[PDB]
Subunit: 498 residues, 4 copies
């Protein structure tokens, strides 16, 4: 059989010589009997003296934590990131310090809208989160399998999720909400194409690329700053599943990705990704035709060729899923020196959003969990107390800064880059920006005839369920993108409606 | 289209005349703009002054509560319970006070092992929970579609769930755990048959019966007590789905039951159940061949004919799923006067288990939620404070009992029945009780040839994935139940393994 | 006796005619007996069937919520705010709409460092929080009895609290931490004087003034904006307690303020405050000698005379302290239209800090608690779900914005004021600003000889416990403020040390 | 100065050679500057990019956990328990395995009604909780400075606390509630005397005795069982504070006990307690004049002499109060083999009450906190997951029992003692039991004239604030206890009321 199905058996093989441990309660008290409870005779009521039963039932009653609001379904793995090229001119981060340096990494793949028990082989963008354990703390690169996103303004992200999730009343998926939101927000059209192409349903997590959608900032030792885009492309090749195969796998094996990744890692076929960066100077950003910080746009390779950096490899499956995968947290705000945020609005929203939900669902001290703990760095600060504070709470050291008792001191070298920003402080509308030129390029050049036909068919099949005026608005947007695109969509919708 | 898909449209039709409300924050402050955020110019960073954005994102980050440890996937409805016959001789409860009395009820159907996003059309026992709003408080009748259960000892319930759920490491369903637990616990064999028969996959919640598996105690005005079993049988008839149809629906519509129930209630086809009780006297309990409090056994109809009581009808869909279905809590300990627990161990375990998990996942004051609040009874007690205590916290009334300031007083008439229990206080083993006679009767008499063949085929198909020795133990147990049963299972397993 | 001690008796007088209510559980089930538990005979063990006992004990176990990190000890009252003058030229807020308008208000007084059981009559700044229930939501004016504060940078606020609170190891008040922090941060000197003057220990909450320390922004209908400072001065007159009297009251009655306020309101002697505002134009802000947004500085009355607005009156004691005082939350971010924040850094920090701690200690939906609920405004938004979500969760309305189904729409008239800000984005040091001129003015002109002598004596008495070098640094700072001040402090410290 | 006030200085002396550590965020990222925030120019608004500020403020906003519903104010210490005598005939517990065995212990003293910032030198019973780290898990002996308690029925405990705590409306201490509850429940009279005697205000935690109020059950290797009462008496001697001195200390130093204990341990003057047990056989329990499981009664020394066992010593102050004292949890249900509960109702109530509140205020996995973790025992079970589950969550081991994959197995030797209990299952009233004979003995024999006079004066001073009929009922109960007692109380109350 496959290794996963033999997991317990392998465990039994590891402890074949060792004797079974003595059963205990939470406090370590041995248990005389766990197959039966205390009663007043053979057919009497239960008693409170059965402390072991109460402890077991109470802990069983509290095994569930709140699921992630998005990306609930997921798989996890661990490995290393290896540097193969020198980019010290662009950044001063310790991860890129020198060639050959190896940094431990924790990786989690996920699906956006699927809940905890949702199937994996469905049409949905795939989230790809990486956590590097560097000497200067944790670095969280939380991207997707797509270099762009539906929207460019953070405040609309919740509503978008509410559109992609179940109806508040019927608790059913409502295509009307999805297509109404997309039609009212044509900026998503680009991503929509990427969603309904062949890449929408990858054949496992090992056969899909990963992109850092946002543009970040890289600062070198001399203080020079350049904007950057992160990419990581799979070395196993791109492979996609047909719609029929995806439905068959969903009915048969909803956990196709988890099983595939686990068996691949166990058998030694370690997946790998090659890491690239695109670099943009401030002058290029000023002269860029579009807004370089727009999450809906991409940097063309011809103007901004990929620059290799290193390689990602995964070589360890989780020992316990809940401890190492369910409780793992990726905060994009964890950026070490040499890497800083950009004026991209979506990134700014994520910076606040992620730690807040992590504190809510995992706890205020979630960072001290072993999977999220920067075990390669020394954490010394003036944060004290907190629920479930493990360790020694930094002992009896002074808890106020500044102080005259040799407490931790700030490091001036880790300051942030300073930039002059013009314009008045207010709300600027970005819905009228260009939303069709790159989509037109993708439709015309990147895709061949067969891919275009499949794209149109899939979009029509999903959109037939929506109401008429929503279909008309979506077709209008597609026609603005390209006439033949909208005409094909309209013909397919007419066929479905008839 | 179906009503559910038109839900929002119907909402728009209700407020066609009414003007749209003004958008506000949580505190009621009007929002100038929600499509954009505050930045330092067109391409500047985000500011903390955007309080509306922080509020929206913080609330979005906290939309998820812990799912139910079991019965996570579910559907909800509301209606009334109507009395059609007089059983005042058996019980004094206000619900059975007189003929024609109507009591509001809230009903929730669920599947045991399926998580939040799990499909409905799968082979799994169906949970059926009812909450009656009586003048003497809430009555929670929390049964299943089966009158029995796999085990008879509460302390084994968590492990059983751990066997029916994902592997701790791979996060995959492991048939090895399930069949190892069942083989080591042959008492489940009875339920296993009920699980693998045609009833294992009902065609929606409206075409399955509901049973109160435990035996309870009914006390009349004169203090006489009799044990009872609750039943509620569907008036729409029993209908089951084939395995192929179930898989097709799971791949197509994981929410088949929710959609079916919602559309049926919306269109006016209100489902109905007829309510019955079996009655046992204490002398009959003493002379019963088996233990009458064993959850694995049933009371034969011939010796204990069904006695009609009333009828259940559902005629209202939830307005909001999360408020009325996700946050609803059924505590079996909520038993009004005239209904009391039995010495059945499993019921005693549930009595403590349910309120504990409810306090954990919903909050200490979960009972004050409108769906769970006994709005037909006046709650006056000496419980004070608590997180998120709504209402007035009973004002400035005295908070200590006894007192000399006209505070609430106990009602002696609501005392419990007193019974003399013999035997010493210790742990009594119940694994050696009879586990094959009723299973043999069910296999031989109740089931016809086709049902027996389908049962054997389904059991073999599920059990082929397990290891060899587990198969041998399960086949041994089936042979103990009946020779032909085990022989057919063994032949099918040999075919699958070959 | 005083009314408070007769509270229960008065309750008994209100329900003299009414019969005592029937005791019930949380679910409304009547309780047969609450004075005794269920046991196996007179001297047997306890049973799980005693559901009432488990419910009562479980709720008793969960009566405590996390106390406020600061301002834990407090008193509460309710009343109205009445407008007496027209300031529509400065602001467009509904509270100042027209003369004679009355707005419900909830008021809470507190002491900063005192914990829940801490005494009230101690030397500590007094927090004064007001919550106006306006048609445009809640307005939270959260000031103190002092118009300034120790620090001007938000990031130092936690450490300051850690200095004013117990040692991490010994759990004792450490004057070394307090005076080390103050000496290292001479900007606090101003506030320190205000702390050690006669006002440091007010004779109850009714004999102290209240100030809105931060400068806010007022916007009129025409879009013109002006900075403002809020004041509310007591009509009962300023009255202070001697140190000996304060210690005597602390040993006798730690709840002196609560009792005083409760009895005053019950007897009809309603306390009152007169509301004033200072107004600054943008030109004046540019030409102001200091930074007008510095929390350590004040606006002189001669240059910026007080302008009366209205009056505050309290006329209702809490019915339940925990529901109406412990669970009340004041978020400064709740600012209706016409009132906006300033570039003061401390205010910006508070804007994020307060709702976060409120969500932590009260819950994500704390705003829906009746005391904090804007019952005079209609809350319509796209926030859904959440733990312990009461009401109907906005029903089945659309949960995504924008939408085409008549959902709530934004109000453009409630937009924020736009201002051009110059300078580069970085961290600017503010520790070198002026810290002695206003302190010198306060020491020389405002205070008479007796007040100066008492100030020096109190400061020396508190500072004698600190180490020598801390005393030298503090004396150096005082000498920088004024020579005689430091000389008197040094002489007193020499006397104490000798 | 005293060591406590020099604490930080001593810390500075320990790291005099070591260089200051680099300041970091929660994730370990170095902080460029912590004295200032990011703004749009010198006088601009705050930005979200200041992640360090948001992290610090968010953690500061979440430094407070729910305080204990009772015994909020407290002090903590650590040390060892040493066996000096052999009682293996009575119990088989590993702590009493052999003479000279030393077991780590964590001790917490507390005051019942005082909140977190409440003063220590007040008239209130003192809670004394001990946690032994034995090879067979944790043993929690959670007693008080008194061998008895006000009530004997668990269901009345919350109301009693509600009487001893602030009014729901005024948030003030109400003597009316306290004395109404005590008068309606005369069974508390015994404890009331113990509360209003000189022992009501001990001169620190080092000068008071500690008692295990409940009667427990001790089982030996051969299965024989005997009931027991635990005692631990201070070796420093009993010392009490006068009312005037107590008020003076409360106004001056509310943390008198904490400071005293910390300085005593730091200076080397380690406090000590001698451990004793009273033993009762089942026949003696049957023939006992009262109910031996009544928490309101005591076992006379003459009939049941004290039997020494060992000694308790404290020799380590907490490194961090919050981690080691605020988050410490004592569950009486943590009883290793050889020690079992009795049919005492109050103990049965505590067994369920304590872990529930601990799960509420500390978290479902509070037992894995280092102070509460049985680091001297191996915890292997089928409990999985849970919020903030540290360690490895027992790895990928099987999570269902029984199983055929070499998972942890039960130990039959750790079974509980079996006893036949007679009588029908119902609610039995215990309010009519004897409530005056032992109180009369305590008033007449144990106390001298001066102690009796001070007791009467203190009771009258507290009770004068109550309403008239409450005073009459309390005086009636005292007269039932003894005539002169009630007469003195009535005369003092008349004097106070006439004022
Ligand atoms: C303003 C825009 C966004 C917001 C507010 C947001 C919010 C969130 C939240 C609240 C979570 C829950 C994480 C947890 O509970 O552990 C999450 C997870 C995640 N998000 Fe986003 N999201 C946004 C856009 C994006 C973008 C643009 C990407 C990638 C290009 C992305 C990729 C992910 C991934 C991969 C996860 C998985 C986290 C994990 O596995 O622990 N999201 N996001």
């Amino acid at each position: 059989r496959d290794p996963a199905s033999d997991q317990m058996q392998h465990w039994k093989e590891q402890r074949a010589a060792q004797k079974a441990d003595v059963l205990t309660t939470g406090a370590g008290n041995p248990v005389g009997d766990k197959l039966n409870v205390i009663t007043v005779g053979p057919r009497g009521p239960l008693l409170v003296q059965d402390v072991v039963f109460t402890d077991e039932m109470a802990h069983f009653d509290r095994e569930r934590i709140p699921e992630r609001v998005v990306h609930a379904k997921g798989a996890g793995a661990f490995g290393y990131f290896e540097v193969t090229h020198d980019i010290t001119k662009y950044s001063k981060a310790k991860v890129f310090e020198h060639i050959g340096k190896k940094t431990p990494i924790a990786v989690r793949f996920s699906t956006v809208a699927g809940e905890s028990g949702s199937a994996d082989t469905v049409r949905d963008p795939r989230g790809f989160a990486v956590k590097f354990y560097t000497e200067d703390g944790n670095w969280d690169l939380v991207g997707n399998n797509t270099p762009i996103f539906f929207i460019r303004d953070p405040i609309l992200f919740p509503s978008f999720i509410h559109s992609q999730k179940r109806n508040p009343q019927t608790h059913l998926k409502d295509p009307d909400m999805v297509w109404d939101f997309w039609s009212l927000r044509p900026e998503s059209l680009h991503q929509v194409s990427f969603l309904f192409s062949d890449r929408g349903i990858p054949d496992g997590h090992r056969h899909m690329n990963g992109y850092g959608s946002h543009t970040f900032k890289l600062v070198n030792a001399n203080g020079e700053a350049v904007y950057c885009k992160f990419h990581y492309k799979t070395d196993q090749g791109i492979k996609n599943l047909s719609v029929e195969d995806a439905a068959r796998l969903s009915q048969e094996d909803p956990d196709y990705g988890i099983r595939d990744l686990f068996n691949a890692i166990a058998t030694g076929k370690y997946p790998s990704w090659t890491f690239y960066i695109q670099v943009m100077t401030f002058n290029q950003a000023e002269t860029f035709p579009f807004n370089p910080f727009d999450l809906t746009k991409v940097w063309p390779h011809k103007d901004y060729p990929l620059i290799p950096v290193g390689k990602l490899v995964l070589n360890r499956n989780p020992v316990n899923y809940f401890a190492e995968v369910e409780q793992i947290a990726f905060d994009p705000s964890n950026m070490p020196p040499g890497i800083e945020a950009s004026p991209d609005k979506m990134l700014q929203g994520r910076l606040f959003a992620y730690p807040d939900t992590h504190r809510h669902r995992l706890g205020p001290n979630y960072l001290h969990i072993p999977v999220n703990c920067p075990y390669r760095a020394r954490v010394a600060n003036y944060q004290r107390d907190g629920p479930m504070c493990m360790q020694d709470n930094q002992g009896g050291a002074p808890n106020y800064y500044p102080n005259s008792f040799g407490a931790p001191e700030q490091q001036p070298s880790a300051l942030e880059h300073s930039i002059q920003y013009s314009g008045e402080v207010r709300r600027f509308n970005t819905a009228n920006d260009d939303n069709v030129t790159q989509v037109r390029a993708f439709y015309v050049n990147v895709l061949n005839e067969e891919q275009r036909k499949r794209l149109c068919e899939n979009i029509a099949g999903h959109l037939k369920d929506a109401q008429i005026f929503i279909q008309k608005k979506a077709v209008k947007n597609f026609t603005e993108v390209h006439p033949d695109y909208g005409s094909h969509i309209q013909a397919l919708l007419d066929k479905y409606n008839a």
